[PDB]
Design a protein around this ligand. Structure first.
Ligand SMILES: O[B-]1(O)OCc2ccc(NC(=S)NCc3ccccc3)cc21
Ligand SMILES: [Zn+2]
Length: 256
């Protein structure tokens, strides 16, 4: 199936998922000088106080930290959003080198990784129904640059040994995602899609201007993960990012 290899990577996805060449695909390059400041954009409201993390899983494409989304515990609202969006999971995209790894780029600059906090619109009842709507998901994207260590990321880094291969999972309770946020909530926003198959155009993207800093040791551990399952040839889970797609008929708005 699809992946990030030379034979099944992003350039091949359109064959099984034609929407790959759609009108509102993600990620995109954020041209800071062309983005339009929108004074009507409200401040973001991130309420992760009652977040309930459950487990961490290696799904063969990335590792996801999953949350209990049966109630409005951890939610995103405000900004360009209308309604309440519940946090269901977060994961990252990273490179084989510090010079690449992010999906979105800023003035063509690639960051070492990119965190995606995925939320779905409660007006649609469940995640499955939400992905079928143009405003079904809200994904908060946060860039990672290599520098000082990120304390709030260490609990994640330390459990990676227990989910090295595809299909592995581990309990991951009491993890506070607030420890992954930068100081500033200034952001760019635009309508887009999932960056992985099925590439549905159901995402309101909110990308934070301020990256978080992580250490070389922390990102290096991400690169020790495996795309393959136990008992199969080892394939290092690196460069699980889709390159920037055509902006087409869209305008990126800035909150600042
Ligand atoms: O492209 B991304 O890595 O970035 C942002 C993002 C958000 C959600 C996902 N997909 C999830 S939670 N399930 C897969 C699925 C989705 C829709 C239908 C079937 C199956 C992947 C990504
Ligand atoms: Zn993602």
């Amino acid at each position: 199936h699809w992946g990030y290899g030379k034979h099944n990577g992003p350039e091949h996805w359109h064959k099984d998922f034609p929407i790959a060449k759609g009108e509102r695909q993600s990620p995109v390059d954020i041209d800071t000088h062309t983005a339009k400041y929108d004074p009507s954009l409200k401040p973001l409201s991130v309420s992760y106080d009652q977040a309930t993390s459950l487990r961490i899983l290696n799904n063969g494409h990335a590792f996801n930290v999953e949350f209990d989304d049966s109630q409005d515990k951890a939610v995103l609202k405000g900004g360009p959003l209308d309604g309440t969006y519940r946090l269901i999971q977060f994961h990252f995209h990273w490179g084989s080198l510090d010079g690449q790894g992010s999906e979105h780029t800023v003035d063509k600059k690639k960051y070492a990784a990119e965190l995606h906090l995925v939320h779905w619109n409660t007006k649609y009842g469940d995640f499955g129904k939400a992905v079928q709507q143009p405003d079904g998901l809200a994904v908060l994207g946060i860039f990672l640059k290599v520098g000082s260590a990120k304390p709030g990321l260490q609990k994640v880094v330390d459990v990676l040994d227990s989910i090295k291969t595809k299909g592995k999972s581990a309990d991951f309770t009491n993890f506070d995602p607030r420890g992954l946020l930068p100081e500033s909530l200034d952001y760019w926003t635009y309508p887009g899609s999932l960056t992985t198959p099925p590439l549905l155009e159901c995402v309101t993207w909110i990308v934070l201007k301020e990256p978080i800093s992580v250490s070389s040791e922390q990102v290096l551990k991400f690169r020790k993960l495996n795309f393959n399952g136990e008992g199969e040839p080892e394939e290092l889970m690196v460069d699980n990012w889709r390159p920037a797609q055509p902006l087409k008929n869209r305008q990126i708005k800035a909150s600042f």
